[PDB]
């Protein structure tokens, strides 16, 4: 079922901003807010699977993405309820100027 | 006289977020936004000056901070117009959610 996720007390703005500080990690967050839950395979970035796995590990450890294992799929979800509880209005400002890749 | 700064055409939102993705780098920006132009010496948020020299380097090359040499002093300026013309409402959104560390 659910993969590792930090608690809300352990989420910082420097970690969220670090996880959004990559072209791929930001497109993952842009698509997870516009298209809802998505499996890791829908992200067809032309990058190695070692870099993609680390990207999702950063997304999870930062408090931004909640990943779940249902079958053989890795389902990711934007933890927007928790990010708007700590930082109200931040995700919207980042997604305003986020240009689609 | 004026250290490297990227043109507004080459500043990306991911690069700006990576430069605010450090508690020390975010503290520098929050001080440059509240108290104005500050010198690198007014920020001792590290045991190593190499760690601090790399912080301003990331802030400079990412398009957030402009640094200028005035004698024995490097003065740092927040590029507010550039970050607000490209990313409207982002810096104020980041600054209002930042916890003061000073
Ligand atoms: Cl390859
Ligand atoms: Cl998958
Ligand atoms: Cl001169
Ligand atoms: Cl100085």
Partner B contacted by A94 (CB < 8 A): yes
- Buried b / exposed e over B23-48, threshold 16 CB at 10 Å, is eebbbbbbbbeeeeebebeebeeeee
Structural domains of chain A, with CATH: 8-98 (1.10.10.10)
Query: How far is it between the farthest Cα atoms of chain B?
Result: 36
CA angle A88, A89, A91 (to 5 degrees): 110
H-state helical runs in chain B: 13-19, 23-34, 49-61, 80-86, 90-96
What CA–CA distance (Å, rounded) separates A97 from B91?
12
Structure tokens of B36? 């104005």
The answer to whether B85 contacts chain A (CB < 8 Å) is no
Q: Identify the experimental approach.
A: X-ray
The three-state DSSP-derived secondary structure of A21-52 is CCHHHHHHHHHHHHCCCEECCCCCCCCCHHHH
The C-alpha atoms of residue A13 and residue A100 are separated, in whole angstroms, by 23
Place of tokens 């000056």: B49
Residue B97 touches chain A, beta carbons under 8 Å: yes
Which tokens sit at B68?
Answer: 């200028």
CA distances (Å), origin A88, targets A63, A78, B4, B94? 14, 15, 34, 10
**Angle at CA B62, nearest 5°, toward A66 and A45?**
45
Q: Tell me the resolution in Å.
A: 2.5
Measured CA to CA, the distance from residue A20 to residue B69 in angstroms comes to: 31
What's the Rg (C-alpha) of chain B?
13
* Contact between chains at B17 and A86 (C-beta distance less than 8 A): no
β-bridge pairing B65-70 and B73-78: antiparallel
Inter-chain CB proximity B94 and A96 less than 8 Å: no
Structural contact between residues A84 and A94, judged by C-beta atoms closer than 8 angstroms: no
Which residues make Cβ contacts (< 8 Å) with residue B96, sequence separation at least 6? Answer: A89
Q: Which helix (H) or strand (E) holds A93?
A: helix A90-96
Instruction: For residues B21 and B36, give the distance between their C-alpha atoms in angstroms, rounded to a whole number.
Output: 21
Residue B18 has a CB neighbour count (10 Å cut-off) of 20
**Residues in B touching A96 (Cβ below 8 Å):** 87-90
Q: How far apart are CA A39 and CA B100, in angstroms?
A: 37
- Axis crossing angle, helix B23-34 with helix B49-61, rounded to the nearest 10: 70
Taking an 8 Å cut-off on Cβ atoms, the answer to whether A23 and B17 are in contact is: no
Q: Which helix (H) or strand (E) holds A58?
A: helix A49-61
> Could you give the CA distance from residue B93 to residue B17 in angstroms, rounded to a whole number?
12
Cα angle B60, B66, B69 (rounded to 5 degrees) comes to: 105
Alpha carbon of A98 to ligand 2 centroid (Å): 24
């Amino acid at each position: 079922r659910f993969l590792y996720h930090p608690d809300r007390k352990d989420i910082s703005l420097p970690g969220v901003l670090y996880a959004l500080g990559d072209p791929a990690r930001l497109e993952i967050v842009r698509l997870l807010a516009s298209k809802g839950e998505q499996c890791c395979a829908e992200f067809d970035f032309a990058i190695a699977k070692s870099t993609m796995s680390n990207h999702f590990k950063i997304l999870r450890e930062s408090g931004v993405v909640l990943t779940r294992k249902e079958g053989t799929q890795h389902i990711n979800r934007l933890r927007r309820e928790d990010l708007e509880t700590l930082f109200p209005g931040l995700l919207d400002a980042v997604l305003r100027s986020a240009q689609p890749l």
